[PDB]
Amino acid sequence: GSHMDPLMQKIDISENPDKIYFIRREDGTVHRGQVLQSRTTENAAAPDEYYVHYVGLNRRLDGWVGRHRISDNADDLGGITVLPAPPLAPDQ
Numbered sequence: 001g002s003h004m005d006p007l008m009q010k011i012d013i014s015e016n017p018d019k020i021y022f023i024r025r026e027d028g029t030v031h032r033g034q035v036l037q038s039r040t041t042e043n044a045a046a047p048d049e050y051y052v053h054y055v056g057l058n059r060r061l062d063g064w065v066g067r068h069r070i071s072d073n074a075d076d077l078g079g080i081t082v083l084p085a086p087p088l089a090p091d092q
Helices: 074-078
Strands: 021-024 030-039 049-053 063-066
Touching (some): 030 074
Antiparallel strands (some): 021 030
């Protein structure tokens, strides 16, 4: 949460627009979605939202989604539409 890495400067679209991005829905069920735009709010030092267009899914569903929801890999999101077992308060 400080100083943007010289590479992790938010996912770049101009490289694979066709590439389908996965987005974890609020309920939890992850679903495909094409990203077209993105904005880092006024602050522009942490905030950032990507416009997602769920493929096949209702157009109304389309909107803005936080970076945390979008990910190139599904496993990170929800392991392919599956809720991960809640941690029993892990601590050494």
